[PDB]
Amino acid sequence: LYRRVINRNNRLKRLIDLGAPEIIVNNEKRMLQESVDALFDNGRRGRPVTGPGNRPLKSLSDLLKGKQGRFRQNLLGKRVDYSGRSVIVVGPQLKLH
Amino acid sequence: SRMERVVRERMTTQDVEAITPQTLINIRPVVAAIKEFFGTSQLSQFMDQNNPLSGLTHKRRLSALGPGGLSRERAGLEVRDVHPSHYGRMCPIETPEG
Amino acid sequence: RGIVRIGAEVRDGDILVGKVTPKGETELTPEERLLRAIFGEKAREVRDT
Amino acid sequence: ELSERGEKLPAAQRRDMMWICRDGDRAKNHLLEANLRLVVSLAKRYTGRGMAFLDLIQEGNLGLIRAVEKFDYTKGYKFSTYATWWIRQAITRAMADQARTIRIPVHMVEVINKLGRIQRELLQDLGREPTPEELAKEMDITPEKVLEIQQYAREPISLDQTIGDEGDSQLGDFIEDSEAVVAVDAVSFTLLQDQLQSVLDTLSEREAGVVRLRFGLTDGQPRTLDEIGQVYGVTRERIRQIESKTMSKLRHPSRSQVLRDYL
Amino acid sequence: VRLTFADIELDEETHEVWKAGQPVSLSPTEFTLLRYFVINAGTVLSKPKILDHVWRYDFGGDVNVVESYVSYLRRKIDTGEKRLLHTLRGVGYVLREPR
Amino acid sequence: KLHHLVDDKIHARSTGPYSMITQQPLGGKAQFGGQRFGEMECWAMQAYG
Amino acid sequence: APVTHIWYFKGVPSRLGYLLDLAPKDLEKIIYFAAYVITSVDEEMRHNE
Amino acid sequence: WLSAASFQETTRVLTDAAINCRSDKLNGLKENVIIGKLIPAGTGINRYR
Amino acid sequence: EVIAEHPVLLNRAPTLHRLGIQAFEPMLVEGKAIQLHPLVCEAFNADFD
DNA sequence: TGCATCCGTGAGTCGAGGGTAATAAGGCAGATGAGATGAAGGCGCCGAAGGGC
DNA sequence: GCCCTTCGGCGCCTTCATCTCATCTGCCTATAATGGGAGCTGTCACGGATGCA
Ligand SMILES: [Mg+2]
């Protein structure tokens, strides 16, 4: 997405400096707006910007939303060290503590 | 379909009588499509074989998820139920608990 | 040839195949230099992954 | 010519001249806007790889913008015939240096494209995948370079695509951070430093300082002998001798066993 | 225990070389470079880690010294323009019999 | 006997590797793992005081 | 060229539309180059002319 | 805003807080859990800490 | 020697209520199965399937 | 002022399970930093030995 | 029995120029070639703009 933003911005700079009919300049400005759109929130407007494998790309907003977002996946609950896991078996000879 | 598109593109760009089916044909998309299907597709999965019954039951199994199917989130309560037409066609007992 | 003999017992942590990669370069610690100076150990220019 | 080394422009040589300037401007814009249809028609065959459709259309628009300037009507051919070459050039150049996440120079993206075309043309004629040695024979170059270009053309993958058959996790969850501190080798390094300090303090202070600044322990830079002489008022041969004394006493098994264990 | 490669041969004791059976006298540090080359035969050599291991870490000179030293190795044993001591642009050198 | 043997089901770690973006330890048996202490267990620990 | 933040232009309330007293249907037509707006007018230059 | 943004409708509340220039106190339970401070309950209050 | 009176927490996903995390004291046991006291199963909602 | 009409939110917990693809692109001039060369200076190290107190 | 102090000897070790070898960037090619491939959408509930009428 950042590469798309950079490409659109550089091409718009070239169009402005060279001097082009206003239709092409307007099209480039629209592409810049849609590229920043995709960067900040992919799929919010129109069909989402898609890469290889035909899957929506993960914009900044998608990195802060839902279960898989940072807030409820890395901040609230984290994978911890000094821990393990195993099957349980009844211990009827053990004490309560 | 990809074959038809590419051959339709190519049959005009070349002059008549200098064009042959071999140069009209580029078999790459067909093998690409079969490789796409057989690998990295969730409807053709790794064989579950740790005893003869698992191998037998992995084939002859009816699935509902995948391309053209419905996802578990997309799946309602009605579809998961047993239809009266399931009798004799699809077993009403064998289904995963997850 | 560098691999475990057929019919040999191994366990968690034992080496299986001896594959050695050129380590390239890094910061050789001065303490490493004093270490090789005490025993005569070679630099061992490759990484044992 | 009239602005610098000119004169006050009269009535008939300023307004009319600027008017024909603007007229040529709008004529160029008119034909350009009329011929963008050719650009958008040509860009259809070019999508499906690297960049999007509209980006290709825009790059073709730039190519046509460049082409209209060099178009010569006096040569008496239709403008489309000349414009097509420039549009194709612009699209190919842009796809070469802009459609890759890892940018590749055109001079060798050319040979990737040619390698691909020759291998897939020979595959159907021979019926099998072309061995890279035979591809090199078709290259008139060494096969090793062929494997190198084959492994260069490989494009990066996405860290966030779901990796499992069922959607539960991303690829990036399974990649270890190599740059992270081990948190075990750090304590080992600190204890090794403590052992080194104890060993050096056991040695004579002059020798300890000599070796410490010889290998740059306390500071950032190890120093040559003449620095040691200037800081200890001795000749460089004497420093060589004291260094000989240092590693001679350091071979003592009392230190050798206690330090060799630390590996 | 003598270390051999193609037509160059080294004795670890008295620090001399045979090139195709002909004894050759060579400089000490130049000999250390050759020792690195044989001790890592078939593996590419880069100027930096060559500087790191063979040379002292206090080396404050320029980078032309290693290139010149490789030139001496060429003119001493591999006098041919094509030589067993191939050079990689930006990646350094390597000891390898050409294919 | 089912294919849920305890040998392939016991896992524990003291200090393993960590992820790139966030420094949280990874998860799974192929990697050294580390149990997920989710927000639901955070609720219990907050309720305990 | 300036661009508009989507978080503010597009949402359940269109915050930019609320501030500027417009509608999102009457904003997408502008920040996506489909229809013009009148940035400013000369009041006195029109009253006398 | 930090607690609300981590519960539901993250983008909406985030945009609203950005507009309002809301100054969080970092005093609640979830905020202290997020930032690593002692939770203000049980053994986290100044009477017991 | 080192497990002398060192408390250790046990948890079972899902952790519904506060008692879903309990601190016990561990005793070394052969095998690879964690031995749970039969009484605290109901609080854990734990079962041995 | 309805009022359908849609449009954006929510929808579980740990564990099997890793990666899939097109196309017309080619000479040619310049430049540029890396690496190939050759030459000359500032000690090294000795090859001699001075020598005596 | 060796320190104080020597000429010089090529070596050697750098260092200055000073040449080539890939490697990369910009430019030109003239019959005509003139408007997207494809996308499959529809869970459940629930608050709110919304285009018109
Ligand atoms: Mg159970």
From TrEMBL, chain E:
Residues 1-97 bind DNA. GO terms for molecular function: metal ion binding; phosphorelay response regulator activity; transcription cis-regulatory region binding. It comes from the Bacteria. One of its GO terms (cellular component) is protein-DNA complex. Residues 1-97 form the OmpR/PhoB-type domain. Keywords: Calcium, DNA-binding, Metal-binding, Phosphoprotein, Transcription, Transcription regulation, Two-component regulatory system. GO terms for biological process: glycolipid biosynthetic process; negative regulation of DNA-templated transcription; positive regulation of DNA-templated transcription; positive regulation of gene expression; positive regulation of lipid biosynthetic process; protein secretion by the type VII secretion system; regulation of DNA-templated transcription; response to oxidative stress. This is Possible two component system response transcriptional positive regulator PhoP. It comes from Mycobacterium tuberculosis (strain ATCC 25618 / H37Rv). The chain holds residues 149 to 247 of 247 of the full protein.
